[PDB]
Amino acid sequence: MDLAYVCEWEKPSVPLACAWSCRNLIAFTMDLDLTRMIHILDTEHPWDLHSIPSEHHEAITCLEWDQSGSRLLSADADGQIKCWSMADHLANSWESSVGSLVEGDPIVALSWLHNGVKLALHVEKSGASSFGEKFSRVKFSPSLTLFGGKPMEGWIAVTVSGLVTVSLLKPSGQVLTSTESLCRLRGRVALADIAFTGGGNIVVATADGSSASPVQFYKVCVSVVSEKCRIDTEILPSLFMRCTTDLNRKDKFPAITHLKFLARDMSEQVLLCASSQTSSIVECWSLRKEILKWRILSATNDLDRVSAVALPKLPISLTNTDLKVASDTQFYPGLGLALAFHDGSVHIVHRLSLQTMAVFYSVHLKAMQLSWTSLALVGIDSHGKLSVLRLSPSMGHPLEVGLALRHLLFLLEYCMVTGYDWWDILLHVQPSMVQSLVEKLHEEYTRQTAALQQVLSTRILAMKASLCKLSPCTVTRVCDYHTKLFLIAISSTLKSLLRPHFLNTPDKSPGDRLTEICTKITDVDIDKVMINLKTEEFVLDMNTLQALQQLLQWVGDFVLYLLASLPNQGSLLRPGHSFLRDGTSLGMLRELMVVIRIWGLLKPSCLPVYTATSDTQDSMSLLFRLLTKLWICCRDEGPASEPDEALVDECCLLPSQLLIPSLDWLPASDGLVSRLQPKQPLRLQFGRAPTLPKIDHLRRLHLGACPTEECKACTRCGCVTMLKSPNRTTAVKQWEQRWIKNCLCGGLWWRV
Amino acid sequence: VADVVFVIEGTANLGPYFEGLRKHYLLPAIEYFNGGPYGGTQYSLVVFNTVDCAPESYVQCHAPTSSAYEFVTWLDGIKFMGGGGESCSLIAEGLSTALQLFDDFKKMREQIGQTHRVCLLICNSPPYLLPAVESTTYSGCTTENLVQQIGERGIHFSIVSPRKLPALRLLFEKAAPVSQDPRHMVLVRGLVLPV
Amino acid sequence: PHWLLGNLVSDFVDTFRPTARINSICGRCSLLPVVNNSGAICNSWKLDPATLRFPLKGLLPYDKDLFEPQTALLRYVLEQPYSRDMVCNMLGLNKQHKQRCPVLEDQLVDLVVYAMERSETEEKFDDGGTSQLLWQHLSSQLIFFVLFQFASFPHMVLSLHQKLAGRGLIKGRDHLMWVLLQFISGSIQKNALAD
Amino acid sequence: LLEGTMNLTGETQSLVEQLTMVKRMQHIPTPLFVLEIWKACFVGLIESPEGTEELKWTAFTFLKIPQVLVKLKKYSDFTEDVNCAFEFLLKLTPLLDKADQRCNCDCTNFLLQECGKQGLLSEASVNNLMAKRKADREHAPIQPNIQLILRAEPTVTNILKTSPEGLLGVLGHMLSGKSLDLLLAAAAATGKLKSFARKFINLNEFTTYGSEESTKPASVRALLFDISFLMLCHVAQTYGSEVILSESRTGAEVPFFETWMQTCMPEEGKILNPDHPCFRPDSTKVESLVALLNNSSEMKLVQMKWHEACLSISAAILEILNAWENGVLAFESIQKITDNIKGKVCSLAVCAVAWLVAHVRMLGLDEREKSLQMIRQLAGPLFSENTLQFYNERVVIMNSILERMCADVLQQTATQIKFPSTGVDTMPYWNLLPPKRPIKEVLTDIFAKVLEKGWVDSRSIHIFDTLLHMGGVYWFCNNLIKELLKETRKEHTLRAVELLYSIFCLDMQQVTLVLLGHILPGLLTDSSKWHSLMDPPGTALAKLAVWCALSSYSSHTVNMRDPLNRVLANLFLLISSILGSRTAGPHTQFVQWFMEECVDCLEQGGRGSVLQFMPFTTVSELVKVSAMSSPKVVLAITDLSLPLGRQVAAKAIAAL
């Protein structure tokens, strides 16, 4: 794997920590007092890293990320398991809140309690047909499961001296903390890990000493009973014998440098990396019913000592039939175990044989965490660097391009269903097959069910755009998709404000009535006849109308622009394409034009103010005439004769009758991807943008030359919007509260 | 003497109107169950977001609280976060969790009182058309079937909505054993509110 | 001291300790009285009304123990019957005004917590078992202190809650509520309702 | 007190080295030195457990400290000095009278005569001091353990300096009761437990003979083997392992008991995987299997090897327990088998329950009833005839060993199997950490108690040890220096560091590494931890750091591969950067204080300000420009006896 990109800073050592989110946010401790600071990274925007003070007191030893993103847990070696949430929703402005404390050091992984949804990826046995059978739901249970059947949030944390801390998080917002000893014989737990056993979440807390002591697994249930947390422990089959203390090579591997359950939520498989000074040996173990007892599932030849172990995070079915077709189709991602060595190398492991799948002979990596699709790494280098290495779906094997297509399509569809993120998949998409991926996405979106297509009718556009940012043959299409997303948004927030009084007789919503009349019945070339054949009882209180002007002026300026671009003046494919030529977006715009006419007949203020050349021309009527002509030409399928000479004749006059405005376009930037290289790395700096490759896009409020007000910015969209909702107390709250979390693409906000 | 459960939308366009809809209807609801804000009335609350969430816990169930003031504290600070650019919030999974609550309340009661269960669906959006894929007790059960099973169990439910939406009238009529602002659609079952 | 000063000031304060020894009653912390109110008050057993520390003469560096709140002496004098006069002359309070002396509040709450703790330990299960003496006294003690306005029942119950919250348990809850009922019946006729 | 509690058998030379160092560093007048040594010995004796730790303190106090003081006399008017010390000591009637009470005899008459017997305390002084002690005795109104130890040392050493059943008579009179711990104590205190253990190990190696027919000599050899195995397994637990260990690695014999010591012998810090390649030889288990099973009567023992019998029992009990689990082997039958295996030499019971401890350690809670019900049986008494020549005492020593071994496992699930229960507490200083409570609370409570009273404790040293192992050296040093840095009064901070130096002597080397490297730079490079380094607590920490640095180096170009050397180099580099920096504050004062103390207690060991690196001596100029300190301390700093040293020291002193 090549470096995606690697960025250092400008410039004793303590253990580091990193945690890659469900979305793409990395949180690494980065011990350079800025030794105790948590760094947050956007991973599609390095060079802007937020340094949370973290207010801890000893080394931040365990970091961990909520299964939903949106929450970060950091425990020190003093005991403050502190929960970091997202201050008014913004990915670069974290805030400290409810946590807990026990003065011993939380040395074992802080775990985040398991919601019921586990996952399943039937990998290539069914990487052909549909979405339900590709990505299935396994029946794992929650921890405490609820009062009423939906999991309770919380965090287990085991400390040296073998305490446990459950600390449930009540929906009320206050913690219910508890503490109880693992085993009555208190003992040293130096390296330890937590994972969750499917049956009712009887979560198992493995805990070893340092050397030649058993690894001593345990069992801890959670027991909300009596309005106070309760935890009950029972020992489990202990496992001595890392299998290196019996080969009569006695002390060649004293210490245990790592023990990590092969996957959280996948207990009954543990990885044990013994080591020494310049030596290491890793072994997996499996708890088989024989009485339960552990026995080696795989062991590795002597190795240079391991510095960091990173586990796969993508759910993959280990069934024999599935691994068979994975070996055939070479869909390697899930079957990976990233071991990082002191010499400088990085090896991937088979996860069931612990052979070597790939190497990166290339200062070692002291903290390493895989991505959520097994396509990226994050190596906090010892000197202070940070690399994002690409792990190819097939470990460098050049197998045919259709197969790479099927691999990446399967992963992207997984990311569509789970909604996690797809920046990693974007790291690998070559510029050659972006068009083909988009075509296969079109297919696999049409084919599915006509029910799930609603779930994905907003993520499909985002993935289409993020793909089309590659492949310089199709950069023209990203602007139009991010405009179609905005058009859909406006249509769904203006067809939802109607609120009539009448419901005349039948089931016909005012938006449904809008659409049915506009499309089916009155394809009249002239407005004020569409206004006639409609109920004029769309009355919003005259305050929200006035607040709606900054948006309706968009739909106005966009109709004007789209109709202006018909003569195709530009030599290249312009930035209004594909909205011409057979779009239903023409129908949507016509609906919005009719409703704007009806609105403005009530309050003239909330109309699109066009700067006209002729004084009394009724500009809206002319634009509606042009739209109707274009939509009549583009409704029925087949005719490339839409630009009938009359229509282009009318359109080429439009600069003479109005002033073609200048719009933002909302890719608003070209992200780090589509810039990296095929192979070459990209040296970066923290706080200094790569030197070379003001519109408030969600309120359409012009910030001046300089902004003078703070503003967030979508990480993937490029959008920029004002942070404090600068409109008056009277402001449409169907918009500012729609984007207050994730923006229309679906990406987090970041402060400027 | 009964236990209620309210299924408010989490994030949809209800957020604006909810501040007024809470008084004129939701305050008389708590009143008809107490005079003027472990045994007896177990209030419950359930919020459900839209599909626009990279998994963020589709439904935030609260708890049963017997204190009418604890319920008004829940009902306040139901932060109406970002609903997507799409209509059609998922009342399906909300109704699924609601029935689970009722069921548990039933297995909790188990005693002499078989009290009338009231569940109110405050949503400005239409149904989502996709089955309850989040719940572990009820999966694949599309909202329609959920409404049938919530009607047969003998619990009467009232959909208040700040906007007159037909996709919800067909919902409410489809199960069976006054508006301060004329735009609202406020149709109640078993609860008496001042006309 | 300040970092520019240093061994000067610390070592000059350390040189007067051979004098603070000649002015400290050896074993002062552990010496306990015999509570007979006929010897109205001895200035030997007095305490600072606000910090519960033995009122020491001058400013010398004394032994570390003489700077710690004498909760032990106060608990002993508070336990014994007929001891309210020695307490009122000890903490220096005088029946002339409202006090809400917070230190007496805290120490009384601690006494009730200690009683709740002693309520366990096999308790002579179906009896008080010489632990009923503690509550028999605590009734009159709390009555005298709060009813004479030197204490505030609301804050006392509030702090008592936090003290027993996260503490072990019941097995002593009936006597506690019995103590409370005394003042309840005493002032639920005159004092305010929310108290 | 620490050298008495934790490490009794340690060589005299080590304690003499440690004690000279402290005297030098803190400039202890030689009269007060011996006063404190003798006071500590008595205090440890008085505050001691009842039965088998009391002999340890008395052996220590009466035999070993005298040889330490002899070696100290060698390493310096020392007679006049110990006389002054004893004059101080006699003028403490409370401590001496409590000693007289507990030891049951005049604890200072004896100590005086014993100190006089060596090269200490000339005879006239002895007579005078004994008269004075009797005079003190007069006013305040079954041989003791003191004289038993003072007689056990010479007699047992000289006669046991070097094969019929008469040897069995000797060993049986040795086991007669409270004579097994006397001999062991007297030997261990005098640096002789090695030779004793080796003598008995060679007796064990011989007695695995198995080349005789008749029953009378066979039984003799048999119970000789049993008693040898029990004696060695007792020396193994109580006086620590690794004293019986094979010193010379010849590589050929490695006698039996050494093998079995490493193979199972569960001792603190060893858990011993069962199913190890060594527990199950699988050569011939059927032999011991039929030997136990078929014969309802007592075993043949006519030619029993015992070389592989105690080894084969580990597999025998395994197979028997598996079969009993399955349901094939008839609970009454296994009752019979356990009766059989206890009925003769109890060494087999020890080895068997050793394997059973190893097994039950590695098993789940639900699957433990059978494995523990086997042990609860093997712990019981025979209650039968046809037993060897000494059964009662053999049973009591076996029960002690078994209790120590199984003490760990039967604490999870709590499995309370009781025991004969003589010698009121056989496990003193056992589980000592209040469960469900964190380690930091217990550490701060123990340390606050240790400040309320100068001397540490006997129990508190064990709590401190269990908290140093459980945890880390870093956690320990951090959460003790954090306590030192909160004390505001000078006397208390000085007492605190004086005590921390001894609480730290547990693993002094690693404590030095971690303290210096990770804690002092952390304090000196935070800009917010700087306020803690103020003057009353800061001078104390500086003294402690200098004492730690000197003690870690003085114990056992310069090899920069040694970690201590690297961390010292880093420490002095940071000293340099702080001295010559733009900002000055409490950090500069602390570094100057560290330098001043390193000059004060500078001795011949740390020649060059110990390990001032070669690019150093460049900040001697800075400790001159910021002198606050007399001249001529800077050549003490300076790397004297060096070519470049000449110039650097000269240019330096030219200024001050």
Curated annotation (Swiss-Prot), chain A:
GO terms for molecular function: nuclear thyroid hormone receptor binding; nuclear vitamin D receptor binding; transcription coactivator activity. Keywords: Activator, Nucleus, Repeat, Transcription, Transcription regulation, WD repeat. It comes from the Eukaryota. WD repeats lie at residues 9-47, 48-95, 96-141, 142-179, 180-233, 234-290, 291-362, 363-394, 395-429. SUPFAM superfamilies: Soluble quinoprotein glucose dehydrogenase, WD40 repeat-like. The keyword Methyltransferase does not apply. It is found in: Nucleus. One of its GO terms (biological process) is regulation of transcription by RNA polymerase II. The keyword NADP does not apply. It holds the Pfam family WD40. GO terms for cellular component: core mediator complex; mediator complex; membrane; nucleoplasm; nucleus. Belongs to the Mediator complex subunit 16 family. Component of the Mediator complex, a coactivator involved in the regulated transcription of nearly all RNA polymerase II-dependent genes. Mediator functions as a bridge to convey information from gene-specific regulatory proteins to the basal RNA polymerase II transcription machinery. Mediator is recruited to promoters by direct interactions with regulatory proteins and serves as a scaffold for the assembly of a functional preinitiation complex with RNA polymerase II and the general transcription factors. PANTHER family: MEDIATOR OF RNA POLYMERASE II TRANSCRIPTION SUBUNIT 16, THYROID HORMONE RECEPTOR-ASSOCIATED PROTEIN-RELATED. This is Mediator of RNA polymerase II transcription subunit 16.
From Swiss-Prot, chain B:
Ubiquitously expressed. Highest levels in brain, heart, kidney, peripheral leukocytes, placenta, skeletal muscle and spleen. Coiled coil: none annotated. It is found in: Nucleus. Changing Y25C: In BVSYS; the mutation impairs interaction with the Mediator complex. Disulfide bonds: none annotated. Residues 1-191 are annotated as: Interaction with the Mediator complex. Transmembrane segments: none annotated. Changing R117W: Found in a patient with syndromic intellectual disability; uncertain significance. Component of the Mediator complex, which is composed of MED1, MED4, MED6, MED7, MED8, MED9, MED10, MED11, MED12, MED13, MED13L, MED14, MED15, MED16, MED17, MED18, MED19, MED20, MED21, MED22, MED23, MED24, MED25, MED26, MED27, MED29, MED30, MED31, CCNC, CDK8 and CDC2L6/CDK11. The MED12, MED13, CCNC and CDK8 subunits form a distinct module termed the CDK8 module. Mediator containing the CDK8 module is less active than Mediator lacking this module in supporting transcriptional activation. Belongs to the Mediator complex subunit 25 family. This is Mediator of RNA polymerase II transcription subunit 25. It comes from Homo sapiens (Human). The lineage of its organism: Eukaryota, Metazoa, Chordata, Craniata, Vertebrata.
Swiss-Prot record, chain C:
It comes from the Eukaryota. It is found in: Nucleus. Interacts with ELK1. Component of the Mediator complex, which is composed of MED1, MED4, MED6, MED7, MED8, MED9, MED10, MED11, MED12, MED13, MED13L, MED14, MED15, MED16, MED17, MED18, MED19, MED20, MED21, MED22, MED23, MED24, MED25, MED26, MED27, MED29, MED30, MED31, CCNC, CDK8 and CDC2L6/CDK11. The MED12, MED13, CCNC and CDK8 subunits form a distinct module termed the CDK8 module. Mediator containing the CDK8 module is less active than Mediator lacking this module in supporting transcriptional activation. It is linked to Intellectual developmental disorder, autosomal recessive 18, with or without epilepsy: A disorder characterized by significantly below average general intellectual functioning associated with impairments in adaptive behavior and manifested during the developmental period. Required for transcriptional activation subsequent to the assembly of the pre-initiation complex. Component of the Mediator complex, a coactivator involved in the regulated transcription of nearly all RNA polymerase II-dependent genes. Mediator functions as a bridge to convey information from gene-specific regulatory proteins to the basal RNA polymerase II transcription machinery. Belongs to the Mediator complex subunit 23 family. The gene is MED23.
Swiss-Prot record, chain D:
A motif (LXXLL motif 5) lies at residues 520-524. GO terms for molecular function: nuclear thyroid hormone receptor binding; nuclear vitamin D receptor binding; transcription coactivator activity; transcription coregulator activity. Its main location: nucleus. One of its GO terms (biological process) is positive regulation of DNA-templated transcription. Ubiquitous. Abundant in skeletal muscle, heart and placenta. A motif (LXXLL motif 2) lies at residues 92-96. It is found in: Nucleus. A motif (LXXLL motif 4) lies at residues 289-293. Keywords: Activator, Nucleus, Phosphoprotein, Repeat, Transcription, Transcription regulation. A motif (LXXLL motif 3) lies at residues 180-184. It comes from the Eukaryota. GO terms for cellular component: core mediator complex; mediator complex; nucleoplasm; nucleus. Component of the Mediator complex, which is composed of MED1, MED4, MED6, MED7, MED8, MED9, MED10, MED11, MED12, MED13, MED13L, MED14, MED15, MED16, MED17, MED18, MED19, MED20, MED21, MED22, MED23, MED24, MED25, MED26, MED27, MED29, MED30, MED31, CCNC, CDK8 and CDC2L6/CDK11. The MED12, MED13, CCNC and CDK8 subunits form a distinct module termed the CDK8 module. Mediator containing the CDK8 module is less active than Mediator lacking this module in supporting transcriptional activation. Belongs to the Mediator complex subunit 24 family. This is Mediator of RNA polymerase II transcription subunit 24. It comes from Homo sapiens (Human). The lineage of its organism: Eukaryota, Metazoa, Chordata, Craniata, Vertebrata.
